Write an enzyme that holds these catalytic residues in place. Structure first.
Site, PDB file in Angstrom:
ATOM      1  N   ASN A 146     175.026  20.693 144.776  1.00 51.57           N
ATOM      2  CA  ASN A 146     174.874  21.665 143.696  1.00 51.57           C
ATOM      3  C   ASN A 146     174.843  23.100 144.211  1.00 51.57           C
ATOM      4  OD1 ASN A 146     172.527  20.942 140.888  1.00 51.57           O
ATOM      5  ND2 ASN A 146     174.725  21.299 140.957  1.00 51.57           N
ATOM      6  N   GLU A 187     162.835  17.532 142.353  1.00 48.44           N
ATOM      7  CA  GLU A 187     163.530  18.102 141.194  1.00 48.44           C
ATOM      8  C   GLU A 187     164.779  17.313 140.880  1.00 48.44           C
ATOM      9  OE1 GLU A 187     166.087  21.581 140.373  1.00 48.44           O
ATOM     10  OE2 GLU A 187     167.236  19.814 141.047  1.00 48.44           O
ATOM     11  N   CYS A 195     171.213  20.557 137.081  1.00 49.46           N
ATOM     12  CA  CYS A 195     170.100  19.808 136.497  1.00 49.46           C
ATOM     13  C   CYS A 195     169.530  20.585 135.306  1.00 49.46           C
ATOM     14  CB  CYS A 195     169.017  19.521 137.560  1.00 49.46           C
ATOM     15  SG  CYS A 195     169.638  18.475 138.933  1.00 49.46           S
TER      16      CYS A 195
END
Lengths: 475, 476, 475, 480
Positions: free
Chosen positions: A155, A251, A285
């Site tokens: 990411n 996370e 996310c």
């Protein structure tokens, strides 16, 4: 062609076997480089070295650990274009925001260093509690935990690595860093910057390798005193399950809803929704992935969202397109299957369902219902479902029925109501009249339910990587 | 006698299994009462009631949650004679200390209520970071986790029950309470007060029963959002291994060393050592359990300690003796192996290695070495080993070699030296010229390494049972 | 009659000069009692006494000083009815509001006690600053300033007396307490309770007398280490100008505006306005004294306000009348003047320009302008002017054109706009959609410009009563 | 060769009235340049410009206020050598120490900037107080006070100037800056760097002038919302006296004692004592100026002290001498009189009375008595009395008798006792086994008694520059 090495006790080395993993550009198929595939024994070697070094690092004066972070930051900002172009190619991130990630990372590191210099201690008198009578004073301070394992996602291969590494090092921990394989060249270039800044030997070790060669071993290792992980929910759960006797911060995935009330500014709402939902093609996310819109405004809202979606540029990372190819074949098929299920079950397609290989066009689905997979499952791709709703209370019910609990948006002119509603949402952060987002980085950042564990953000991160040490004196 | 019921959804009941577990007084081996032996299915009901009630509980204004704590504490303090007597009998705690436990519990409850009342939120402007919007404002407050599993030990079955329960409830969580079986009756009596104080239905549930039935089931249940455990290291590690996706807090065993240097005040030192070591006959996680004394002063310190150890009265809990019977047969036998292993290896017996049933005399052992079991193993019994040491550097090493890391004590005239020595000890809390101890209850409390995970004490308890809720306001 | 003595060094005495000042009830003129008129030399005795007692009181463990406060609060609460009836009589305060003063005072005392107990120190490492580098540690604790001079107003003779004494005493200071002559009996009864609870001799000293004899003398005295004062702005400026080399805390006059926008709930607005403006007949520093209402809603709002004002019970303190007689003769004539000036220049009298000696009818004036005194001057009486205004912008300019800066209220459904308007108002506290008010007492309370100096409220007051003491260790 | 102009409203201007005040090197008497002597109007004009720019500046995103500080700090560091050299000449400060002043200044400005970024707000709920409303929420923040008057000394004319200006601007106040006239050139050069860093117009104004044509008028000005002052006690006093209705922060004089007990490392003590007392020839508010030494150890410590004092070099600031000339004629005359009175009342001269004009030898006196002026009066000069004492108790008493109350040192191996002793000392800060000093700058700094008013250091400064701003909202109660 970056045939990168890994860092162990201050030197850049290859795996003992010589075995390597190939890395290619998602957008192109072109060979970018390679990383070492490390064995369990070299994992053990790195951890031991970090433990050894932690004993000399913790004892350094804070301002010295602060100065390394500042020198590291300066070198990243110096190498913004070079590192930026590598992220772009390695994870197919649009050019300017690959550069923008590196800038922001240098900003996160600096702020973290400055924050660490202001972790004051406190003193407590014994008679502040009834029956304590006053002869004793407690000096409370913070102590590092030891060796931090930091696991970053594809990411944000620089940002979400440095966001972990920086607080761990500055508080006097050492770090074992395991980048996502895709994102590992980028991660390694970031660490090269740290080493070039003068990181002492063993202070940071880099470990690369396959998810099932070294994964559990790393997570279950008695030398690891703390794990921070960003990534998939499944992997994170497994990490929690396997970890023992240590703090763990997670996370994970998100299915953030934007709740849209009929008094909403529908042009602001549409803009924020499209911005938050389609950033990096939905590969995040923290992103609007669900819309709950009251009936009466749905048609105008959808028509606004449709217009902006159709303006988004689709193409190459190098061309700075809004929508770039997704990370891999496997991801593309997953988003596709979600699109399919929706349309089968009767969803209205307002825009998209187009692709060339991994390059998916932005998809907008209306008249989505709970019977559809796309209503719950995180796509990690450029698809946005709209679910029509009767009132706030139905929006809340469906919002809370998600296994997810990361962030929520609430769009309405009536701020008092929005606050009240937000309190009934099981999320880490509620955004009033704004898209969901991670930053700015000083705010507390966290997921509840299956979206995470512990708290990140600049100061909370510092806290999670340290512990109280009490000294009691008799006055 | 006390054939107790448990609390579920505001009702006092027995088990659908029809089974009970009998509880005896450790000083006399005579029957005291019994508790329901619940099923896994009764655990589910408890957990489900707790989750339902939390949704209503968490919306209550703080002052109302704070008002329940006050009502609870007042009723506790009011019944301190009754509850104290039951603790005394259930766990063989000296009479005045058992009553003192309830007194301390009522105080802990009020301070926690006081502290929860003074929990202020925080605001942050975007652009307190480069280069955030300005006129974006986050409001940060503490939100409850959900349902809190509190697991308490036998040795403080009210104090260490309420220390977990009061912070959880006041911050808007509900609690499923699993007391140690031995100490269950005391725990139930403490909960009765909470119920009589007007706890709404389902905010506190009491679970009792066989480990083989409910232990792993509670710790693995998806409806549990946090666990706080005090007890043995082995159980703690097992809880940690088995739980997932939730915060876990653990206060476990300790082997607190007391380092006594050349310049120490040897009278204050002996006194502090004996007080700390033999309190509740050594059945404390936080207690001097190891003495590292510079051989230069060893002979003197050992003559001071011996005097005070022979001063301790040994007898029944009702008589308020300093040394009362140990919790059970298994425990007494374990302590005995430790003593025997030490002598078998040439340690010196200075004071009584004598017993009557489970009532052991306080035992002092000189000439203990790194080779003896009692150098390392937590006895949870009235035995103190003394280890001769070359210098500060040997004690630091021998201290740190231990798996445990709860607290330590440094005895020396040289404050400056003690501080830097304390720096090198891997522990939660270092006491200078004083015994180890959990309180005063506002001090942070924690064990590192095998001694614990996370942190306790009034304010860190409040933090541990909540999480940040952020509401970001847009003002542009 | 209650012929009071004052406290000095533990004993209750009269003045050596044998003189006394008579105190009668403002509502009925009945003699209530008297107080000693102390000399400047009895004042010196009070201050020397307090000074010596402080050296001894500061060394008490904190837990002993909180316990004294608890005993005092418990005693005042038990004496609610008695101390409460004296207040209604002494200062024509409605019976329920007079008894409530005492209850609240006790709460303030306990909360101040609780908060002093949890004031903790801080530690600082030298290496938290570039250089520093080492084993230098600062232990930052809090130290009492010395003798505190507390000067209280007529309008809250117990609440505002104890809100100054309680934080001064608990933090290791001693107090020379100077009540308003009108309010002194009530003040002295509150002190009886302190002393009955075991206050050490000289800890609390009461001074009473003539302004021309003792006022400047108290304020200019070298033995005074801190002043806290509540009263008129003019008297407050004279304090500030005359005091030297010491912290001075002042809470003075107000002219708190209520700004009413287009979209306001005009019913909730009217109710908050009337309740705030006319509580204790306007004899309050914190109270709406000006309404700036947008033209479009003015007619309606003024109708809503008129309706509620005419409902107001006007009469005796013992009867719990809404409006009761104002403090004295001066006061009522000054208020008549302000009303008179407004009428003579074009203002519209909506309700009540009726006077019955010192009993004044609630007066509502509409069409008030910048050229009228009542737009600016604090009346300290039951009069409210409504000013009609173009917009938010005009409301702000006229608000800030006042010398006063205490509090303000903003009425609008646009919470976001209210907050932004609030930021442009030069006052201590802005209340959104509610009346101005001092409590709840943990809220910081302060005025800027001519309204005050420094900060009050539980914790801010404690802070103002102490200074930092640093001890730096070097290991 | 520096005829300096003043800053008003973004433009470097001169007095219309055309008058200047010439400045001279104290070590030489050689000319350095001049400053404009300003009038009552040009002073109001500066105050108004600051008030109008206050409303633009204060609403700038806080990050924009800190970037200006960073930029200013960078430019000062860059001009280490230029600014530093001006300081050594103008106030006669040893060369490397004057450059050091500029280095440390940028360090204070950066740390102040970062500290401002971290002034977080708080929220309170109504029901945290008995009877209070659960649907009331107070958002508490900090708001600038307005225009801040910063008045700095000759002492530290860059350091003690920026220590006031930085926290003021970064929290959204504006500044009227009045340097000590001796030091005005160095302060102007400091301000120049702030201007070249991009300070918007008005945020910083420099007011220079004699010190009566402007003195009272400034301190009495309704346009001033806060005063922060470092300097002489008598001047401090006047300011407190003449100002009303505003916060006033004062850093004034000290007579810091050194307490030396029997169980002390007399080598380290002797070294800390001399380093601190004689640093910048004793022209420091924070500095050891009194030694109370226990009798059983007196001879040996005063022997050590004598040695190090004879090791101190005497000369000009350019040469980096330990002891350079004192600020002016007046000051040296006043110092000489303190020595005289002491010798006249029979104090033993242990070393170097010697003085040639401005330049004074470091002067060591022994057997100093409570009857001698030098035991009490801050000399602002290279003189150090030793007072032979019996115990800590006598040391505590004689310590507390001074009207001053800035800082103090205790010397002992018995740390707990030192901590006990320090507690009976009426000072802001007690140092255990080290000299007195203002730094490190994140440490709170304050003088009590006649030594000052309010608090400094980095964070405490920010708080003194602001006030609470409370917004109370109504929390909606339900929906559902």
């Amino acid at each position: 062609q970056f045939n990168a090495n890994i860092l162990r006790n201050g030197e850049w080395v290859e795996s003992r076997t010589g075995e390597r993993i190939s890395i290619s550009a998602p957008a192109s198929g072109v060979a970018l480089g390679s990383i070492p595939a490390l064995s369990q024994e070299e994992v053990n070697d790195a951890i031991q070295g970090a433990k050894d070094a932690q004993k000399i690092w913790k004892i350094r004066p804070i301002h010295e650990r602060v100065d390394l972070l500042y020198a590291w930051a300066d070198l990243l900002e110096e190498r913004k274009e070079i590192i930026g172009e590598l992220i772009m190619h390695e994870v197919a991130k649009p050019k300017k925001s690959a550069i923008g990630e590196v800038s922001r990372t240098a900003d996160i590191i600096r702020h973290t260093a400055d924050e660490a210099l202001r972790l004051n201690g406190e003193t407590l008198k014994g008679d502040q509690f009834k029956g304590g009578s006053s002869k004793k004073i407690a000096l409370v301070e913070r102590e590092p935990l030891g060796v931090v394992l930091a696991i970053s996602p594809f990411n944000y291969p620089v940002n979400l690595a440095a966001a972990k590494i920086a607080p761990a090092l500055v508080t006097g921990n050492t770090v074992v860093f395991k980048p996502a394989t895709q994102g590992s060249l980028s991660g390694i270039k970031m660490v090269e910057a740290l080493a070039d800044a003068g990181a002492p030997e063993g202070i940071i070790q880099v470990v690369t390798g396959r998810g099932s060669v070294i994964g559990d071993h790393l997570v279950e290792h008695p030398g690891i005193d703390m794990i921070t992980f960003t990534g998939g929910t499944t992997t994170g759960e497994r990490i929690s399950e396997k970890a023992k006797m240590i703090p763990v911060v997670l996370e994970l995935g998100g299915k953030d809803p934007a709740i849209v009330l009929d008094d909403a500014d529908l042009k602001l709402t549409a803009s924020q929704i499209v911005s938050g939902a389609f950033s990096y093609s939905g590969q995040r996310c923290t992103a609007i992935k669900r819309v709950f819109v009251q009936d009466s405004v749905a048609d105008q809202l959808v028509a606004n969202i449709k217009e902006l979606v159709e303006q988004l540029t689709v193409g190459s990372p190098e061309d700075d397109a809004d929508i770039t190819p997704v990370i891999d074949e496997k991801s593309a098929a997953f988003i596709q299957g979600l699109i399919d299920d929706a349309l089968e079950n009767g969803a209205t397609l307002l825009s998209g369902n187009k692709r060339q290989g991994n390059l998916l066009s932005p998809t907008l689905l209306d008249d989505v219902t709970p019977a559809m997979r796309v209503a719950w499952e995180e796509p990690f791709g450029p698809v946005l479902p709209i679910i029509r709703v009767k009132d706030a209370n139905e929006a809340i019910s469906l919002s809370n029925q998600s296994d997810y609990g990361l962030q929520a948006s609430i769009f309405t002119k009536d701020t008092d109501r929005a606050i009240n509603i937000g309190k009934h949402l099981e999320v880490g952060t509620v955004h009033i009249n704004a898209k969901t987002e991670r930053g700015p980085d000083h705010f507390p950042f966290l997921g509840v339910k299956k979206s995470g564990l512990g708290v990140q953000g600049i100061k909370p991160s510092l806290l999670s990587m340290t512990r109280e040490r009490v000294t009691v004196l008799n006055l």
